[PDB]
């Protein structure tokens with residue numbers, strides 16, 4: 141179907157997924173992180189201890205200067221840049237060349253990650269959350285208007301399998317970003333769609349949460365406290381303070397046969413099990429019910445411990461499989477990160493203002509269980525879950 145784009149993503153979920161791209165004339169190649177969490181196409185345009193390479197504007201005959209600066213701070217950090225434009229392409233993507241807005245990053249604190257292997261970020265969200273403002277057209281918006289590529293893209297993040305490293309990056313590809321299409325070889329079963337509440341972040345509405353079938357039983361509005369978005373840039377599944385606690389307890393209980401340190405459930409410290417003996421069956425499956433496109437109808441996606449327990453290279457890299465509990469609390473609402481996406485083929489159907497989920501043909505699981513997507517359900521009381 142889209143053989144060309146299949147498996148065009150790499151990196152490390154923990155350090156983000158990225159795709160190859162080229163900017164300027166002649167072509168300058170750079171790894172760009174795929175982030176559904178933002179709307180700026182920003183690349184390193186100056187040396188930095190963590191950049192193997194960067195965008196060299198003086199060497200591009202098509203580069204154009206907008207003579208406008210941009211300051212973006214975030215978490216005790218920030219990236220500063222100079223706005224401009226140039227021609228862009230995606231080798232393992234559509235065979236097209238567009239002209240996009242490019243923030244040439246010139247100074248940054250806490251942005252570029254050591255080891256990730258990407259020198260830039262491709263924000264696929266809407267302009268509403270673009271810096272310095274919504275007038276700076278996002279990349280995909282430009283791509284869709286300068287070509288005939290369909291206004292939609294889908295993602296299948298396969299998180300590989302076992303612990304990887306900066307070296308294992310260019311050895312085992314991570315996943316796929318299919319631009320302008322939906323690839324039938326990336327999923328099994330049906331594709332279920334949930335509406336996009338507001339086009340700024342990819343915001344959705346969750347109506348119910350379950351732990352091994354048991355209802356978390358909270359006012360559905362609490363689940364979307366502030367907001368709920370899907371973000372390929374975020375590693376963990378992030379949930380409000382309350383929901384978070386309620387969940388850890390339920391998860392704690394479910395797994396009682398064995399006890400772990402409070403440090404584990406805080407993401408502070410990890411756990412290990414003699415190679416090959418990880419007791420998956422002891423940990424519970426998790427499920428989020430989403431609002432359906434059809435009124436009063438809803439469906440659910442379900443992940444396994446193989447999705448929320450991230451494999452990490454042991455401290456002493458011994459012969460023991462250790463794991464990190466990838467479920468943490470949030471204050472900015474729910475973030476459906478990689479622990480969620482690595483279970484499904486996710487479709488960002490902007491043209492129809494919806495997002496679809498399907499079982500990933502590459503998700504991790506043992507023969508006893510499997511991730512799922514099932515519907516329809518009728519648990520009256522849904523739009524009422526939307527926060528304001």
Ligand SMILES: CN(C(=O)CCN1Cc2cc(C(=O)c3ccccc3)ccc2N=C1N)C1CCCCC1
Pocket residue numbers: 155156173175176177178212213214215217218219249250251252261371372373374375
């Ligand atoms: C925190 N990260 C996330 O992916 C979670 C949600 N975000 C935040 C985010 C922040 C930025 C920045 O402007 C920035 C500035 C200085 C230092 C760090 C970040 C840009 C895009 C963002 N998109 C998200 N998905 C980080 C995960 C690694 C990639 C950077 C964002």
